[PDB]
């Protein structure tokens, strides 16, 4: 499709068939097809998580700033007390995630093998591509066109960048992200990274 750097030739193994292909592989990780498939699934799930994470750590801060709800920052959520101890919640999450991730890994290893419901035999998932299960995971039954996949991949990449920026810019300056943006908007020329620390 497009080029990530004009005047540079794209690698041969990247043929533009995959969604969101711009021929960006300077270090040549995806030379073997098996590595390409594994990294494709990684870039999907890694990033599908990141979009939710970024929205969750950003939107409550804005809502709190404008004043509807009073919620602790994304850092101080762990220090807060909940109805149950953190250990029990961690154990529940560990067991459930073990189950679901082993199901997904089995699907990736042997496509079209774990579609059948173990408990209720009649229900099943319609056949499709790996990484896009569809079916019950798509209640509204949207169209899985290539454009939607490209939009999802671009949003996921932006989410990666947003999360890395959030974490590092909190590490350098203890202030929150939205407050950092507001401080920069107060006076751009005196509040950038270079001017302060």
């Amino acid at each position: 499709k497009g080029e990530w750097l004009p005047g540079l030739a794209s690698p041969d193994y990247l043929t533009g068939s995959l969604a969101g292909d711009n021929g960006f592989d300077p270090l040549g990780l995806a030379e073997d097809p098996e590595n390409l498939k594994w990294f494709v699934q990684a870039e999907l799930v890694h990033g599908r998580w990141a979009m939710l994470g970024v929205a969750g750590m950003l939107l409550p801060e804005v809502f709190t700033k404008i004043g509807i709800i009073n919620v602790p920052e994304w850092y101080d959520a762990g220090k807060e007390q909940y109805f149950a101890s953190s250990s029990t919640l961690f154990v529940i999450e560990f067991i459930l995630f073990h189950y679901v991730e082993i199901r997904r890994w089995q699907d990736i290893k042997n496509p079209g093998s774990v579609n059948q419901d173990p408990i209720f035999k009649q229900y099943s998932l319609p056949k499709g591509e790996v990484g896009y299960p569809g079916g019950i995971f798509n209640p509204l039954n949207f169209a899985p066109t290539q454009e939607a996949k490209e939009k999802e991949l671009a949003n996921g990449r932006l989410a990666m960048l947003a999360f890395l920026g959030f974490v590092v810019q909190h590490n350098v300056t203890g202030k929150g992200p939205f407050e950092n943006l507001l401080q920069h908007l107060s006076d751009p020329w005196h509040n950038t990274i270079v001017q302060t620390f």
């Binding site: 109805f83 101890s85 250990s87 029990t88 961690f90 154990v91 774990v114």
Partner: protein, 194 residues
């Protein structure tokens, strides 16, 4: 009926044997003689654990302490055992140990003299007075049920031992009571992370 859907079955395990689900990640059953010996050992372990688990559950349900304290009398010199709250007149370490050794050794050596591999797993005859094994139709179902219950009993014994190790001087029943005291506080969390 595989243990993990989407995973190929091993060659030597096709599903003919009762309670076979094609589970062998380490490939220990390649040698047929080793497979038969493993079947024997598994059946014996299952039977012993099945006989043992009620022997832990019924005590500590009455006023008697638990499966650990009932073992502490042998540590004290000159101690005497008790049964149902009554001290056994013949309770002392040397006689008890000698009787156990003689009886168990004779029984086990009698067991080991059988030659037919099938007759070792399922002797039949005089061992079953009721005679549930005459009809071959229900034999496979009964064998599968026995294997599954024995595996469950083995897991129960593992849980008992691990719970005892985590909390010294604690029985399974009081552990269940403590867990039911507050389900959201007394779980595996406090021992898995300090």
């Amino acid at each position: 009926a595989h243990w993990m859907p989407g995973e190929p079955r091993p060659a030597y395990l096709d599903g003919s044997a009762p309670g076979d689900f094609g589970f062998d990640p380490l490939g220990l059953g390649e040698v047929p003689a080793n497979l038969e010996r493993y079947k024997e050992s598994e059946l014996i372990h299952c039977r012993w654990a099945m006989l043992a688990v009620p022997g832990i559950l019924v005590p500590e349900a009455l006023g008697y302490g638990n499966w650990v304290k009932a073992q502490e009398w042998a540590a004290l010199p000159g101690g005497q055992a008790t049964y149902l709250g009554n001290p056994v007149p013949w309770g002392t370490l040397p006689t008890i140990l000698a009787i156990e050794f003689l009886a168990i050794a004779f029984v086990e050596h009698q067991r080991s003299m059988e030659k037919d591999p099938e007759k070792k797993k399922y002797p039949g005859g005089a061992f079953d007075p009721l005679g549930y094994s005459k009809d071959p139709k229900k034999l496979e179902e009964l064998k599968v049920k026995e294997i599954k219950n024995g595996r469950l009993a083995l897991l129960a014994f593992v849980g008992f031992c691990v719970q005892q190790s985590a909390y010294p001087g604690t029985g399974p029943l009081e552990n269940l009571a403590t867990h039911l005291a507050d389900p959201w506080h007394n779980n595996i969390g406090d021992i898995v992370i300090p």
